[PDB]
């Protein structure tokens, strides 16, 4: 395939990462994942807006404007002939002799982007998934979508080992988000989810789901709930660019309600489905 | 120069890092820094013991033994002809298609190691430095020396912008460590430092400085102290492989006592000196 390396689209084999790339020694960079449906990028502007905001938060100045960045992504999709799957892209502060503080503002940021054909998790959207509770030991700036992902890596593996699909994290019993998704709970036709502060990533899927709820007149309350309250919910699901709206029917051996996909989750899924590209 | 790449010492230009190296995508790896004095490696075994402990804490299996790793560093020092400086080395989980969970146990960890010529911090060791307090917002497993260093990066930059050498971190007003060092405080002839738990990295120089304290009969108490207590200390200093024992004489424009290096710091520095690699007559 072809990889985006800065502003060029090169063959995979051509890309070489420097051992002193700050993204390799300090996890000093930010990333995004954009889902593609039948050749079309879903909510691409929102993801690009978020990439730039993340970079701005740790003071990385991206050398291209948003219009150029958008253009490159389109070229990347086209050259690789991507139908349905996702684009992964990241930006690191640059290559410089190892030192914690920022380099001289002459160093250029390194941009890597590549695609992967990957089908929609249809089986999961229908049947639902298993999850587990993992304590959130991450840093206090979860709002930045950075490359420092060791906390999420350790959580995802704890779940993967128990045969669970996702690890729902919690700070002292208060549910925050999942290792790579946002968590939603429904009780009496009302949608609950942790507010978007420094404790969680302000997911783009999460915001699309909240817009879907507003469109079907379902009340939304951005209030955090405990692990205990979560098990008492009528319905529960996690959201992410790749997981879309995945129902969580069971957590740690305790079924959520009856262990079936609730009524409102289906309504959200149907509304969400009206937004994804489906050209002929 | 030459770079250690897995189990081989090769020329820099031959090293090729893959975009899906987990160290590049998730900061999934651990690291060590070893100081070299006039060709001799300082406390190398402790550092290697710590690299293996860190890797083990995140379930990475270093493919070869400690003796092989040591032999390799020695080679690396020899090939690069390093006099005084340090060896930086890191291990990541490996290259695998992007996914958060561990790959199959058939993926081999990536080992990268290289040297840098760097003199002892003479002026700092003698004159002392200024520091600044920064809120510790890092993750809760700071005992693991991993590649997730963005908090330390934002912290050191903050110190650097205010013209300071190091950022003294504090969690809930309690002093933990510096962005790349340990912090010690001296009061009425007693040595204080945060205990070695999940809140700080158990530094090698830290352990060496405590060993030095026992040797000069200086009492040591591993109890945490707050920002307020730190500013009322008689003496204060930071420790690290590259900083050794660097006196902190000021924090945010507040002199520690009178702004001069203290007697116990000086004594600790002299005792530390006897541990550094040196000949016998040269
Ligand atoms: C990526 C990610 C999400 C998912 O957000 P989307 O923007 O909807 O893909 C949620 N939480 C965390 C911690 C993430 O890293
Ligand atoms: C490396 C590191 C130290 C340094 O300890 P050494 O004495 O060099 O072993 C201290 N604190 C942090 C946060 C570090 O990452």
- Do residues B134 and B81 share a domain? no
CA distance B115 to A61: 30
Domain limit, last residue, from B118, B147, B175: B118
A64 touches chain B (CB under 8 A): no
Domain limit, last residue, from B100, B118, B136: B118
- B139 alpha carbon to ligand 1 midpoint, in Å? 18
Domain limit, last residue, from A62, A90, A118: A118
CA distance A42 to A216: 21
Q: Note down the domain range covering B98.
A: 1-118
Find where tokens 């208060």 sit. A174
Find which of B15, B147, B155, B161 to mutate to test the A interface (most A CBs within 10 Å of its CB): B147
Q: Does residue A48 contact residue A87 with C-beta atoms inside 8 Å?
A: no
What CATH number does the domain containing A39 carry? 3.30.470.10
- B227 alpha carbon to ligand 1 midpoint, in Å? 36
For the record, the structure tokens of B141 come out as 């497993």
Q: Does residue B73 contact residue B89 with C-beta atoms inside 8 Å?
A: yes
- CB-based contacts of A104: which residues, under 8 Å, 6+ apart? none
- CB-based contacts of A50: which residues, under 8 Å, 6+ apart? A32, A145, A202, A204
Cβ within 8 Å, pair A26-B151: no
CA distance B50 to B176: 20
Q: Does residue B131 contact residue B181 with C-beta atoms inside 8 Å?
A: no
In chain B, how long is the greatest CA-to-CA distance? 59
Binding residues of A for substrate: 31, 98, 100
Q: Which residues of A107-117 are buried (b: 16+ CB within 10 A; e: fewer)?
A: eebbbbbbbee
Q: For a pocket test of ligand 2, which of B86, B175, B203 has the largest count of ligand atoms closer than 8 A to its C-beta? A: B203
- Do residues A113 and A136 share a domain? no
**What is the CA A6 to chain-centroid distance, rounded?**
22
> Helix (H, G, I), strand (E, B), or coil: what is residue B271?
helix
Cβ within 8 Å, pair A150-B27: yes
Q: If contacts are CB pairs under 8 Å, which of residues 77-136 in chain B contact chain A?
A: 88, 90, 97-98, 100-102, 112, 114, 116
- A19 alpha carbon to ligand 1 midpoint, in Å? 28
Which ligand has the shortest distance to the CA of B179?
2
Our CA dihedral for B34, B40, B46, B50, rounded to 10 degrees, sits at: 30
Quick one: DSSP state of residue B64?
Answer: S
What CATH number does the domain containing B184 carry? 3.20.10.10
CA distance A259 to A247: 10
- Do residues A84 and A112 share a domain? yes
| Angle, in degrees to the nearest 10, between helices B263-273 and B204-215 | 100
Q: Which of A206, A224, A199, A198 is nearest to A136 (CA)?
A: A199
| Angle, in degrees to the nearest 10, between helices A204-215 and A44-57 | 130
B33 touches chain A (CB under 8 A): no
Closest CB from B21, B28, B90 relative to A150 = B28
- Do residues A103 and A189 share a domain? no
**Chain B residues in contact with A147 (beta carbon < 8 A):** 24-27, 150
Closest CB from B27, B112, B148 relative to A19 = B112
B179 touches chain A (CB under 8 A): yes
First to last CA, chain B: 28
- Residue B257 φ/ψ region, left for φ over 0, alpha for ψ in the -120 to 50 degree band, beta for the rest: left
For the record, the structure tokens of A278 come out as 């489906």
CA distance A133 to A226: 11
- Do residues B207 and B232 share a domain? yes
* Any atom of ligand 1 within 6 Å of the Cβ of A201: yes
Environment class of A57 (CB within 10 Å of its CB; exposed 0-12, middle 13-18, buried 19+): middle
CA distance A54 to B265: 42
Which ligand has the shortest distance to the CA of B169?
2
CA distance B202 to B182: 8
For chain A, breaks with the C atom over 2.5 A from the next N come after none
- Do residues A263 and A130 share a domain? yes
CA distance B43 to B33: 11
* Continuous H helices in chain B: 22-25, 44-57, 66-80, 122-127, 150-161, 204-215, 227-230, 263-273
Q: For a pocket test of ligand 2, which of B180, B207, B242 has the largest count of ligand atoms closer than 8 A to its C-beta? A: B180
What is the β-pairing status of strands B110-117 and B2-5? antiparallel
Q: Does residue B178 contact residue B184 with C-beta atoms inside 8 Å?
A: no
Q: For a pocket test of ligand 2, which of B181, B204, B207 has the largest count of ligand atoms closer than 8 A to its C-beta? A: B181
DSSP chain A: -EEEETTEEEEGGG--B-TTBHHHHT--EEEEEEEEETTEESSHHHHHHHHHHHHHHTT---SS-HHHHHHHHHHHHHHHT--SEEEEEEEE--B-SS-SS---TTSPPEEEEEEEE----HHHHHH-EEEEEEE----S-TTS-BS--HHHHHHHHHHHHTT-SEEEEEETTEEEEESSSEEEEEETTEEE---SSTTS---HHHHHHHHHHHHTT--EE----BHHHHHT-SEEEEEETTTEEEEEEEETTEESTTTS--HHHHHHHHHHTTTS----
CA distance A88 to A33: 5
Q: Does residue A27 contact residue B11 with C-beta atoms inside 8 Å?
A: no
CA distances from B216 to A13, A64, B41, B258 (A): 59, 59, 25, 24
For the record, the structure tokens of B37 come out as 């004095």
Which ligand has the shortest distance to the CA of B208?
2
**Chain B residues in contact with A116 (beta carbon < 8 A):** 97-98
- The order of strands in the sheet holding B8-11 is B8-11, B2-5, B110-117, B85-92, B29-37, B40-41
- Do residues A72 and A184 share a domain? no
Which segments of B137-274 are extended strands (E)?
166-171, 174-178, 182-187, 190-193, 220-221, 235-240, 244-251
- Domain assignment of residue B282, yes or no: no
CA distance B121 to A10: 44
CA distance A121 to A250: 18
Q: How far is B38 from chain A (nearest CA, A)?
A: 22
- CB-based contacts of B150: which residues, under 8 Å, 6+ apart? A26, A27, A28, A58, A139, A146, A147, A148, B27
Q: How was this structure determined?
A: X-ray
Q: Which of B189, B148, B210 is nearest to B22 (CA)?
A: B148
Find where tokens 């912090």 sit. B183
> Helix (H, G, I), strand (E, B), or coil: what is residue B223?
coil
CA distance A159 to A161: 5
- B181 alpha carbon to ligand 2 midpoint, in Å? 5
CA distance A236 to B9: 53
Closest-lying ligand 2 atom to the alpha carbon of residue B207: 7
Q: Does residue A94 contact residue A107 with C-beta atoms inside 8 Å?
A: yes
> Helix (H, G, I), strand (E, B), or coil: what is residue B249?
strand
Closest-lying ligand 2 atom to the alpha carbon of residue B182: 10
- CB-based contacts of B219: which residues, under 8 Å, 6+ apart? B189, B190, B191, B213
First to last CA, chain A: 25
Find where tokens 């010492």 sit. B9
DSSP B8-62: EEEEGGG--B-TTBHHHHS--EEEEEEEEETTEESSHHHHHHHHHHHHHHTT---
Question: Cα Rg for chain A, rounded, in angstroms?
Answer: 19
CA distance A178 to B136: 23
Cβ within 8 Å, pair B153-A114: no
Cβ within 8 Å, pair A24-B23: yes
Q: Does residue A41 contact residue A74 with C-beta atoms inside 8 Å?
A: yes
Q: Does residue A177 contact residue A243 with C-beta atoms inside 8 Å?
A: no
Residue of A nearest to B91 (CA): A25
Closest CB from A28, A114, A150 relative to B153 = A28
Atom 3 (ligand 1): residue with closest C-alpha? A181
CA distance B282 to B264: 29
- Do residues A21 and A34 share a domain? yes
What is the β-pairing status of strands B190-193 and A129-135? unpaired
Q: If contacts are CB pairs under 8 Å, which of residues 195-254 in chain B contact chain A?
A: none
CB atoms within 10 A of CB B281: 3
Q: Which residues of A160-191 are buried (b: 16+ CB within 10 A; e: fewer)?
A: beeebbbbbbbbeeebbbbbbbbbbbbbeeeb
Q: How far is B111 from chain A (nearest CA, A)?
A: 11
- Domain total of chain A: 2
Q: Which of B146, B144, B97, B115 is nearest to B41 (CA)?
A: B115
Quick check: is B145 catalytic?
A: yes
- Do residues A179 and A261 share a domain? yes
- Do residues B64 and B150 share a domain? no
CB atoms within 10 A of CB A201: 22
- Do residues A160 and A29 share a domain? no
Closest-lying ligand 1 atom to the alpha carbon of residue A239: 8
> Helix (H, G, I), strand (E, B), or coil: what is residue B63?
coil
- Do residues B200 and B144 share a domain? yes
CA distance B248 to B235: 8
- Domain assignment of residue B211, yes or no: yes
CA distance A22 to B147: 10
């Amino acid at each position: 395939g072809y990889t985006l390396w800065n502003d060029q689209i090169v063959k995979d084999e051509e890309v070489k990462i420097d051992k002193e790339d700050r993204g390799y020694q300090f996890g000093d960079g930010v990333y995004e994942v954009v889902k593609v449906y039948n050749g079309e990028m879903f909510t691409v502007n929102e993801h690009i807006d978020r990439l730039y905001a993340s970079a701005e938060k740790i003071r990385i100045t991206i050398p291209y404007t948003k219009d150029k960045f958008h253009q490159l992504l389109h070229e990347l999709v086209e050259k690789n002939e991507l139908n349905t799957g996702h684009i992964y892209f990241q930006v690191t502060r640059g290559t410089s002799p190892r030192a914690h503080q920022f380099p001289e503002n002459t160093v250029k940021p390194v941009i890597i982007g590549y695609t992967k054909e990957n089908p929609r998790p249809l089986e999961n959207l229908e049947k639902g998934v298993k999850a587990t509770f993992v304590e959130d030991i991450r840093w206090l700036r979860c709002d930045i979508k950075s490359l420092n992902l060791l906390g999420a890596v350790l959580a995802k593996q704890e779940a993967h080992e128990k045969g669970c699909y996702e690890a729902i994290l919690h700070r002292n019993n208060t549910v925050t988000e999942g290792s790579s998704s946002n968590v939603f709970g429904i009780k009496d036709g009302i949608l609950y989810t942790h507010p978007a502060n420094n404790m969680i990533a302000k997911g783009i899927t999460r915001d699309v789901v909240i817009a879907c709820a507003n469109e079907i007149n379902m009340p939304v309350k951005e209030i955090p709930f405990t692990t205990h309250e979560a098990l008492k919910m009528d319905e529960l699901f996690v959201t992410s660019t790749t997981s879309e709206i995945t129902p969580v029917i069971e957590i740690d051996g305790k079924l959520i309600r009856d262990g079936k996909v609730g009524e409102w989750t289906r309504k959200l899924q149907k509304q969400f489905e009206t937004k994804i590209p489906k050209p002929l």
